[PDB]
Design an enzyme around this catalytic site. Structure first.
Site, mmCIF file in Angstrom:
data_model
loop_
_atom_site.group_PDB
_atom_site.id
_atom_site.type_symbol
_atom_site.label_atom_id
_atom_site.label_comp_id
_atom_site.label_asym_id
_atom_site.label_seq_id
_atom_site.Cartn_x
_atom_site.Cartn_y
_atom_site.Cartn_z
ATOM 1 N N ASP A 1 0.839 -1.191 0.000
ATOM 2 C CA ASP A 1 0.000 0.000 0.000
ATOM 3 C C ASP A 1 0.874 1.241 0.000
ATOM 4 O O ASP A 1 1.989 1.222 0.518
ATOM 5 C CB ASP A 1 -0.912 0.021 1.228
ATOM 6 N N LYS B 1 -7.704 0.981 -5.512
ATOM 7 C CA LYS B 1 -8.923 0.431 -4.929
ATOM 8 C C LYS B 1 -10.173 1.087 -5.496
ATOM 9 O O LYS B 1 -10.199 2.290 -5.759
ATOM 10 C CB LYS B 1 -8.917 0.611 -3.410
ATOM 11 N N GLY C 1 -3.260 -8.207 8.318
ATOM 12 C CA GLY C 1 -2.524 -8.435 9.555
ATOM 13 C C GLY C 1 -1.108 -8.924 9.336
ATOM 14 O O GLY C 1 -0.451 -9.379 10.272
#
Lengths: 258, 255, 259, 269, 259
Positions: free
Chosen positions: A19, A67, A200
């Protein structure tokens, strides 16, 4: 054209998609060896400002993703017309259509879709997803749910592989998935598209665990750490040498606060 | 018919954005950006002060709408007196009658009403609504999810009706608690017999264009307003042009 | 309009008594006792009766002949229309053929009778084409309590509708889940837009007169289940004609036999 | 494909009335009345219901006899999931196999894999998803079933309207919403779209359950079926009745004819 | 090992059909029809059969003789072993003698057959000593639906186990509540570690062949409840031997009589 998009995705195998919310990071990400970047920027969360997407698409030489809210086919139309390589119809953004996902076949660019189980994966693929990411928890630093979903998908795949052919009809019903794709999956012995893990993944150990479970790569949301550049490279190395514990010790060695 | 005339008035708004404004300043900006009309608004939320509505009307040349509370037929009498172009019997402000809407056939001014499904829409139209707004979230959530839901529900039911066995339409009308003759008409037109605008959560050009591609006739909208408003107007006007939509959305500022 | 005409056809039954019959004999006994019309019919699934026995009945009497079709069984209806029945009774006393839809009655030239338990249901049947409403209570019990309930229900709501504020009729229509046009049309006329009879439980002259005194345009009877049918039939017929005449009601109820 | 061929083979049944039979005489009376095919079984559904016990495939003997008494196609029922009862029917040389839910379910979780057979299959259904699942399993012909052995047609009407209802909904549906529709139906996306494009079931679709009178049979045809099953012999005079039902299906849109064939038919079940 | 030997003894029954018998006559009819073994047995509490009738059966036929003992009734077992039975069936079709424990079968020299409905239960019985597993559906109904369920259940899980990740087998063992050793041993062999027959409902040749086609090593039958037992018995025996031969299955099912 669908089998072409699928192929375009198989390129990313063995990679780490990172990201990024600006150019600097996109470079700090490519400089660490990411196989691609994911452009972004309480409160409704939507597609990112094209400008910032162009600033990133022209700042790096690796594929650029972005996105688009689930079901928001116009946010996707805009991303496509921008000239990015991959569109991720992502559930981390604010859901836009609770009942239907984007018809992705109506697009040239390849689509990434999230999933939590095998039926969910197969439905996204039938909608035209060229790549599937099995998502756990988003933004918690905890990989427990990702492990759950990865084992869930790979688990049923193994069940399907050796299943009596007569019983597959009922299995497809229970999964709520297209029979054709189920039998396909049974023939291939794996997802008919690239499969990454996401959610995570904070440390190098996490990334390697996903690979050892049988994933083709991982997403990372690294920047929430004390030293990005170092952490990024370590995670990249972890994915590349996910079988070398001696190597995993080095890259995990003094990586700062996670 | 007088109803046909009212339905004809709203039809001029097709292809446009309607902007909610709270002063002459906001109204002027909205007009400059190409809004087809402005809807005036000023705890209990009520009809706006007639003084404000008069100032807005004088300051712009586009049609002016104003809100009345659900069931508050006097507020509607007042708005019609000071000569607004449309009255929105609006669930966004505080309902005044929980059981009955305004008998809109008693007015000369065309009415907009909200709806979340086809049965609702048709009930409002039978009461004399000349136009319908398919509504999502009531607050300023900037989230278009409920709007998409309710637009798809309306559009989807219309498609089901279009092809339905004629014998089954009676029960269908009962199930959605709608007047049969209007259900029949909607079936014939393959469309709701009045203009239909999406509303609720429209924040970006992409949102507004999405509504149009879903089949709406236009949209309502609630750190650089002039630009954002122009972008949305353009979006609605060129909703099928991805390249334009791209330009419109570029550096629009914080939504 | 075709519908208006059908409605007109049913008005020639007002003040009358419709009797169920299963043979030509009963049909004559029914006509002989002064029945306005006869209804042709024969556990176990109950369907439309054999056209054979229907033809025999339509050839024995000179009064209008009605026949039952199962709810939603539009083909049964077609068959009844093709054999020249005067009225079709889409009746719930037969075995329901369709649970969610009734026959689209407009698609027929013959007038239909439908049953109902309340105003909303009556208006829905009418919107589907029904030209005559049967407010039905209990079938085959001889107990009129349910018919009274329904008659009062329909007539009660009609009176509420008559004086209701016009701005509240829309919501009322919704609550009834009935077509707004017919609701307003019912408001105007101050009564049901079509002929209304009572059915279910009517076993004595007093029962029949009670229905008329409540507001019914006539009654159905389901007679031969009595001791002396010919006698009981005439009494009920007279009861309907002289429903506000106690002296007469006493005269026809006297020594009627086992009811 | 061999499936395209089986589907074709069933097209010849459109406009037909299939009849249950328990012996030769009956099979002969069924063809003599103009039945497009007979379905051999050792007990009619009404008797199955009223009796009980376990209803299985019928003894080949009684199937071979029937298949030698008539010239029209001969069908036979195989318990749901019982793929060995099927194999046996296939070997016996029957035209069609009905994996029938009026017999005693043999497998609660899995239907017979019908593709593994060269002989065409008929499967029962109650809604669109159930039909599309049976078809994907190989079924070449579908019969939407109401209730069996009651003489009440209400459930058949419910199911017919159910299947045809969704088919019409599907036809006019927004393309982007069909995926979700397939999920909700729990049916293969391919067959759903093939049903959308075609505007009907991609195979022959018959009605079955409680069809007692000519009016019943004609009703099913007017609702959009391709023919009907009748489980006739439980009535007054089978021959006259069987003939009337056949005629009703052939003249389903002709009330005058319907009145004719219904007159003095005798006592129905 | 003693257990391995018992397991070996049960393998000489593969491809066979075991038939219930209550007299010497039936036992012969069973052997005459080609039964691999016979099972000796006679509301009301159901217990082990009288040794008298067991001895008479073991003296009429030359094939292996089995007998039932109530679940948990280890003394009944002891008595059967002492009279030279070839196999003991700790069967749930008899009246359960112990609700919480099964017989400790290792403490015997005679091989045991136990019933089961799923993999976990089969493996628990095996760990207790069982040398042969009977996957049981419904008893005394003639309906094989339950047997199919259980066979598919056991075989389904066995296939899941075959391809399962080794690190997940521990949790799987827990979910089955079965001994880990046997689970892994089942994973390796890719099948049940012992002979597996089907029982319950098998009433026709087709039923028996279906069980074999599903994966069963053989079947039990509970025959004389048919019209012509001798004929039906042979048909079922042939069905088991030629379970993948439709032509044959048709030939033995033809004119079998009342099943």
């Amino acid at each position: 054209p669908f089998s072409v998009k699928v192929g375009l995705a198989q390129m990313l195998r063995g990679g780490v998609i990172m990201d990024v919310v600006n150019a600097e990071q996109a470079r700090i990400a490519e400089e660490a060896g990411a196989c691609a970047v994911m452009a972004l920027e309480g409160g409704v969360a939507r597609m990112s400002d094209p400008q910032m997407i162009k600033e990133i698409k022209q700042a790096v030489t690796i594929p650029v993703m972005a996105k688009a809210r689930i079901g928001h086919f116009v946010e996707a139309q805009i991303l496509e017309a921008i000239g990015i390589d991959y569109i991720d119809e992502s559930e981390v953004l604010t859901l836009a259509d609770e009942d239907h996902h984007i018809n992705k076949h109506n697009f040239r660019i390849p689509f990434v879709c999230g999933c939590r189980n095998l039926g969910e994966a197969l439905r996204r693929i039938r909608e035209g997803a060229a790549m599937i990411r099995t998502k756990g928890e988003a933004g918690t630093g905890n990989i427990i749910e990702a492990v759950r979903h990865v084992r869930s998908v790979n688990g049923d795949i193994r069940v399907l592989r050796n299943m009596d052919d007569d019983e597959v009809f009922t299995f497809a019903k229970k999964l709520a998935a297209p029979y054709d794709l189920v039998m396909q999956t049974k023939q291939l012995g794996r997802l008919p598209v690239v499969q990454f893990a996401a959610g995570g993944v904070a440390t190098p150990a996490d990334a390697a665990l996903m690979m050892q479970l049988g994933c083709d790569g991982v997403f990372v949301g690294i920047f929430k750490s004390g030293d990005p550049a170092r952490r990024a490279r370590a995670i990249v190395q972890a994915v590349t040498h996910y079988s070398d514990p001696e190597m995993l010790v080095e890259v995990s060695c003094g990586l700062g606060e996670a | 018919h007088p109803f046909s005339v009212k339905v004809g008035l709203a039809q001029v708004l097709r292809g446009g954005a309607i902007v909610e404004v709270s002063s002459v300043n906001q109204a002027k900006l909205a007009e400059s950006a190409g809004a087809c009309s402005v809807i005036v608004s000023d705890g209990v939320r009520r009809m706006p002060d007639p003084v404000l509505i008069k100032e807005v009307k004088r300051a712009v040349s586009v049609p002016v709408m104003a809100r009345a509370r659900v069931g508050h037929f006097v507020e509607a009498q007042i708005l019609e007196s000071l000569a607004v172009d449309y009255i929105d019997e609006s669930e966004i402000i505080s309902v005044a009658d929980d059981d009955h809407f305004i008998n809109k056939h008693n007015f000369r001014s065309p009415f907009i009403c909200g709806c979340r499904d086809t049965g609702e829409a048709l009930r409002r139209i039978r009461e004399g609504a000349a136009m319908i707004r398919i509504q999502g979230d009531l607050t300023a959530t900037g989230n278009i999810a409920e709007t998409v839901k309710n637009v798809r529900s309306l559009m989807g039911e219309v498609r089901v009706l279009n092809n339905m066995d004629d014998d089954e339409v009676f029960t269908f009308a009962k199930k959605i608690s709608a007047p049969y003759d209007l259900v029949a008409q909607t079936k014939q037109m393959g469309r709701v017999p009045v203009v239909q605008f999406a509303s609720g959560g429209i924040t970006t050009p992409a949102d507004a264009a999405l509504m149009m591609q879903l089949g709406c006739d236009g949209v309502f909208v609630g750190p650089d307003p002039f630009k954002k408003l122009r972008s949305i107007v353009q979006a609605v006007q060129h909703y099928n042009d991805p390249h334009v939509l791209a330009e419109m959305s570029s550096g629009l500022e914080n939504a």
